[PDB]
Amino acid sequence: HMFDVAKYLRRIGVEGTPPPTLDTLRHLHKRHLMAVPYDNSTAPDRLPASRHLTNVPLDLVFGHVVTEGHGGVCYELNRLFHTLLAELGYDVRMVAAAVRQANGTFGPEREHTFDLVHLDGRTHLVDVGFPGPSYSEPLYLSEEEQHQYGCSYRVTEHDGYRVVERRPKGSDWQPVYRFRPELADPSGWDAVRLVLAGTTFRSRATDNGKIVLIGRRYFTVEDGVERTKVLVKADEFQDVVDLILAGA
C-alpha cells in the first residue's frame, strides 16, 4: 500500500502522469536507468528465508529504492518497474533469462528477471535492472537490427531461446542474455524463487551511455565508444562509486 506512482516518478525525474504510449515508455526506461543505479551491495540483507520473492513485501523494496534513494538488483528494480508500468496502464509481462558469462556459457536459466510490454501490436523488452552494458531504451522483440546511443542490438532466435545481442563500436556482436518468450507471464513476479564480501556490481546509465563498476573493473561507454580501466587507488575507486550512486 506504500507503492506510490507519483513518488516513484519524482524519484526518476519524470513530470506528471505521462500518457501510455511508446514515447513515454522510452522516456521512463531511460530515466529509470539514469536515476536508479544497479547495486548489489546490500542485496543479501533483503533476501527472504523462504526463498520466495513474494515474501519480500513490495513496500520494503519500494522504501529502499524509491523512498530512501538506494539502488537494487534485477528482481528489485524490474519488479518495481513492472508495477509502475502496470499502474500507468501498460500490458507488462514478466520474463526470466540466463546471462552470458565471461567464459561464453549461459548461467542458470532464471537468474535474471525483466519484463516485456505489448503495446499497439508490438512487443518491447524492458530492463532497468541489469548491471552490465545493455540497452538504455526498450528493444523490439525482433532479429532486425536496432540502433541506440552508438550501439546496435538484435534479438535473435537460437534453439528455443530469444537472445539479446549487443554490438558497440569497433567490436563484434556479443550476447547479453537469453530467454524463452513463451514463458512470459503477467503474474510472473509472484512465481520467482531466490570472508571477503562477494563481488560488488554497481552501474547506471548516462545521457549517452552507461558507467559500470564490477569489483575494480570500471567500464564506460559514450556514444558507443567503450573504455575500461582496472582501478587501483582507493580515492579514485570511491569517486567512481559516488558518481554511479548519485544518479543522473
Numbering used by the authors: 0 to 193, 204 to 257
Q: How is this structure described in the published paper?
A:
Amide synthases catalyze the formation of macrolactam rings from aniline-containing polyketide-derived seco-acids as found in the important class of ansamycin antibiotics. A key enzyme is the amide synthase ShGdmF (hereafter abbreviated as GdmF), which is not part of the PKS and is thought to catalyze the release of the ketide chain from the acyl carrier protein (ACP) domain of the last module 7 of the polyketide synthase. The overall folding of GdmF largely resembles the common architecture of its NAT analog, revealing a three-domain architecture with an N-terminal α-helical bundle (domain I, residues 1–88), a β-barrel (domain II, residues 89–185), and a C-terminal α/β-lid (domain III, residues 211–257), the latter being connected to domain II via an interdomain region (residues 186–210). The catalytic triad (Cys73-His111-Asp126 in GdmF) is highly conserved with an rmsd of 0.04 Å compared to the catalytic domain of MlNAT1 and is buried deep in the large active site cleft between domains II and III.
The substrate-bound protein structures agree well with the ligand-free structure of GdmF, with rmsd values between 0.05 and 0.137 Å for all backbone atoms, indicating only minor spatial changes within the subdomains upon substrate binding. To our surprise, we could not find electron density for the different thioester groups in any of these structures, but we found densities for the cleaved SNAC or pantetheine groups, instead. The SNAC and pantetheine groups are deeply embedded in the wide active site cleft, with the sulfur atom of the sulfhydryl group at a distance of only about 2 Å away from the reactive cysteine Cys73. GdmF, therefore, appears to be capable of directly binding SNAC and pantetheine thioesters and catalyzing the first step of macrolactamization, i.e., initiating nucleophilic attack of the activated ester carbon by the thiol group of Cys73 and thus cleavage of the thioester in the absence of arylamines. The bound SNAC and pantetheine co-substrates show conserved binding positions within the active site aligned with the β-strands of domains II and III. Two stabilizing interactions of the sulfur atom in the thioesters are observed with Tyr37 and His111. Although the orientation of the SNAC units within the hydrophobic active site cleft is the same for the different thioester derivatives, two alternative conformations of the acetamido group were observed, one of which forms an additional hydrogen bond to Gly110. This flexibility reflects the predominantly hydrophobic nature of the interactions with aliphatic and aromatic residues in the active site (Val72, Tyr74, Val98, Phe129, Pro130, and Phe210), and is consistent with mostly hydrophobic amino acids surrounding the catalytic triad in known NATs25. The SNAC (Kd = 1.16 mM) and pantetheine (Kd = 1.32 mM) prosthetic arms exerted comparable binding strengths in the low millimolar range.
